[PDB]
Motif scaffolding. Sequence first.
Motif, PDB file in Angstrom:
ATOM      1  N   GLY A 163       0.809  -1.233   0.000  1.00 48.53           N
ATOM      2  CA  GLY A 163       0.000   0.000   0.000  1.00 48.53           C
ATOM      3  C   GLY A 163       0.833   1.271   0.000  1.00 48.53           C
ATOM      4  N   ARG A 164       1.907   1.316   0.797  1.00 43.74           N
ATOM      5  CA  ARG A 164       2.690   2.579   0.936  1.00 43.74           C
ATOM      6  C   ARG A 164       3.883   2.657  -0.029  1.00 43.74           C
ATOM      7  NH1 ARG A 164       1.171   5.551   5.294  1.00 43.74           N
ATOM      8  NH2 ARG A 164      -0.169   4.517   6.845  1.00 43.74           N
ATOM      9  N   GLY A 165       4.155   1.616  -0.820  1.00 46.61           N
ATOM     10  CA  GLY A 165       5.363   1.641  -1.674  1.00 46.61           C
ATOM     11  C   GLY A 165       6.610   1.258  -0.890  1.00 46.61           C
ATOM     12  N   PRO A 166       7.787   1.890  -1.104  1.00 40.06           N
ATOM     13  CA  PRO A 166       8.995   1.590  -0.328  1.00 40.06           C
ATOM     14  C   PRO A 166       9.301   2.612   0.756  1.00 40.06           C
ATOM     15  CG  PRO A 166       9.633   2.781  -2.278  1.00 40.06           C
ATOM     16  CD  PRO A 166       8.107   2.916  -2.113  1.00 40.06           C
ATOM     17  N   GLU A 167       9.656   2.123   1.944  1.00 41.15           N
ATOM     18  CA  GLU A 167      10.082   2.951   3.062  1.00 41.15           C
ATOM     19  C   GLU A 167      11.417   2.445   3.585  1.00 41.15           C
ATOM     20  OE1 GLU A 167       6.862   1.111   3.981  1.00 41.15           O
ATOM     21  OE2 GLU A 167       6.106   2.287   2.303  1.00 41.15           O
ATOM     22  N   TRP A 168      12.232   3.370   4.078  1.00 47.03           N
ATOM     23  CA  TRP A 168      13.533   3.016   4.623  1.00 47.03           C
ATOM     24  C   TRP A 168      13.379   2.668   6.096  1.00 47.03           C
ATOM     25  CZ3 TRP A 168      18.049   1.107   4.154  1.00 47.03           C
ATOM     26  CH2 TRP A 168      18.776   1.258   2.967  1.00 47.03           C
ATOM     27  N   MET A 169      14.181   1.706   6.556  1.00 46.96           N
ATOM     28  CA  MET A 169      14.222   1.346   7.971  1.00 46.96           C
ATOM     29  C   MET A 169      15.565   1.706   8.593  1.00 46.96           C
ATOM     30  SD  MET A 169      11.271   0.283   8.937  1.00 46.96           S
ATOM     31  CE  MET A 169       9.795  -0.121   8.028  1.00 46.96           C
ATOM     32  N   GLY A 170      16.665   1.066   8.192  1.00 51.05           N
ATOM     33  CA  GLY A 170      17.901   1.304   8.917  1.00 51.05           C
ATOM     34  C   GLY A 170      19.174   1.019   8.159  1.00 51.05           C
ATOM     35  N   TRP A 171      20.272   1.578   8.689  1.00 49.51           N
ATOM     36  CA  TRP A 171      21.611   1.457   8.106  1.00 49.51           C
ATOM     37  C   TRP A 171      22.576   1.169   9.259  1.00 49.51           C
ATOM     38  CZ3 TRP A 171      18.121   5.245   7.812  1.00 49.51           C
ATOM     39  CH2 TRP A 171      17.510   5.532   6.595  1.00 49.51           C
ATOM     40  N   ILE A 172      22.736  -0.122   9.623  1.00 49.79           N
ATOM     41  CA  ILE A 172      23.676  -0.503  10.679  1.00 49.79           C
ATOM     42  C   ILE A 172      25.020  -0.900  10.086  1.00 49.79           C
ATOM     43  CG2 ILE A 172      23.124  -3.012  10.915  1.00 49.79           C
ATOM     44  CD1 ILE A 172      23.346  -2.511  14.007  1.00 49.79           C
ATOM     45  N   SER A 173      26.091  -0.428  10.723  1.00 47.22           N
ATOM     46  CA  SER A 173      27.443  -0.854  10.391  1.00 47.22           C
ATOM     47  C   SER A 173      27.789  -2.104  11.196  1.00 47.22           C
ATOM     48  CB  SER A 173      28.439   0.246  10.704  1.00 47.22           C
ATOM     49  OG  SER A 173      29.767  -0.241  10.666  1.00 47.22           O
ATOM     50  N   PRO A 174      28.176  -3.222  10.567  1.00 47.57           N
ATOM     51  CA  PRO A 174      28.549  -4.406  11.350  1.00 47.57           C
ATOM     52  C   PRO A 174      29.959  -4.361  11.912  1.00 47.57           C
ATOM     53  CG  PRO A 174      28.907  -4.890   9.088  1.00 47.57           C
ATOM     54  CD  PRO A 174      28.473  -3.447   9.142  1.00 47.57           C
ATOM     55  N   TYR A 175      30.756  -3.346  11.579  1.00 45.83           N
ATOM     56  CA  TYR A 175      32.137  -3.277  12.036  1.00 45.83           C
ATOM     57  C   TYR A 175      32.261  -2.573  13.378  1.00 45.83           C
ATOM     58  CZ  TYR A 175      36.938  -1.447  12.257  1.00 45.83           C
ATOM     59  OH  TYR A 175      38.200  -1.086  12.664  1.00 45.83           O
ATOM     60  N   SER A 176      31.312  -1.701  13.709  1.00 47.46           N
ATOM     61  CA  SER A 176      31.285  -1.015  14.992  1.00 47.46           C
ATOM     62  C   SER A 176      29.826  -0.875  15.407  1.00 47.46           C
ATOM     63  CB  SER A 176      32.000   0.339  14.898  1.00 47.46           C
ATOM     64  OG  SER A 176      31.245   1.261  14.134  1.00 47.46           O
TER      65      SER A 176
END
Lengths: 128, 112
Positions: free
Chosen positions: A41-54
């Motif tokens: 219904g809403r199209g695309p939404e952003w959730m998160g950007w986690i760095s796995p190195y820190s």
Amino acid sequence: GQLVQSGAELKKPGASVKISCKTSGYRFNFYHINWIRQTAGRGPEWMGWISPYSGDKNLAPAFQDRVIMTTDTEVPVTSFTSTGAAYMEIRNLKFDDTGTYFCAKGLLRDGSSTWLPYLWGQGTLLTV
Amino acid sequence: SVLTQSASVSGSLGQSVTISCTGPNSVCCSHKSISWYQWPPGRAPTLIIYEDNERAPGISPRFSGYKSYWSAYLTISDLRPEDETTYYCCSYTHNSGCVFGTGTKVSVLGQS
Ligand SMILES: *[C@@H]1O[C@H](CO)[C@@H](O[C@@H]2O[C@H](CO)[C@@H](O[C@@H]3O[C@H](CO[C@H]4O[C@H](CO)[C@@H](O)[C@H](O)[C@@H]4O)[C@@H](O)[C@H](O[C@H]4O[C@H](CO)[C@@H](O)[C@H](O)[C@@H]4O)[C@@H]3O)[C@H](O)[C@H]2NC(C)=O)[C@H](O)[C@H]1NC(C)=O
């Protein structure tokens, strides 16, 4: 990369879920993990950007305090191609959150184009 | 969808179509970086453009991108039938997350 997601789950409203994806064949530390929702219904939404190195995390303003993202340590299958996992916890799901969830690998290690998703998995269907 | 597109794009087999993606001055393109994506609804997307015109690995040179002070464009030539997908433009900064926009269907008129 061949990202593999946890798989589809069905759940009652007003609750929390933990969704996890398992990386393979690329070093896990080097490339950011980019968590995404596509609500039909809403199209695309952003959730998160986690760095796995820190512990560096970045989150969209619409979802502050509502979702907590974390990662495991990698396991060295061989040099420069390891295996590692990342998961996100989303509190208080509603009807609005009925769509396909993807995690993705960052494009580059360095430069202005980091934090940009390149590889994508099959994804999981969340129905609520 | 602060990053607005035209939502109606069509091109003919062998000709070249163009797709635009503009928005406000708070979520813009002159002071931002533009990336383009091929996203069939139901499948996992694919990268075409990342910085503003630079081409992704594994993309035929038939694709390209340009950036004005108020909008960003892609010019796709040699429209094979497999180009009937949907493209979502992405506005991202170096030290923050991208802001995906609306969706534009592309139609290959004149196929068989
Ligand atoms: C081991 O390997 C890891 C992973 O490969 C390396 O970590 C990467 O390091 C690069 C270079 O520093 C990082 O790229 C830079 O990221 C910044 C984004 O993070 C900022 O913003 C967040 C906001 O939440 C803060 O938390 C964070 O502390 C930062 O402030 C940008 O600021 C950088 O942009 C700058 O440099 C680019 C380079 O061209 C310019 O274009 C920009 O204009 C600007 O000057 C840059 O993008 C990358 O993100 C890191 N990756 C990860 C996964 O963390 C380690 O450095 C490496 N370690 C060693 C010791 O070698």
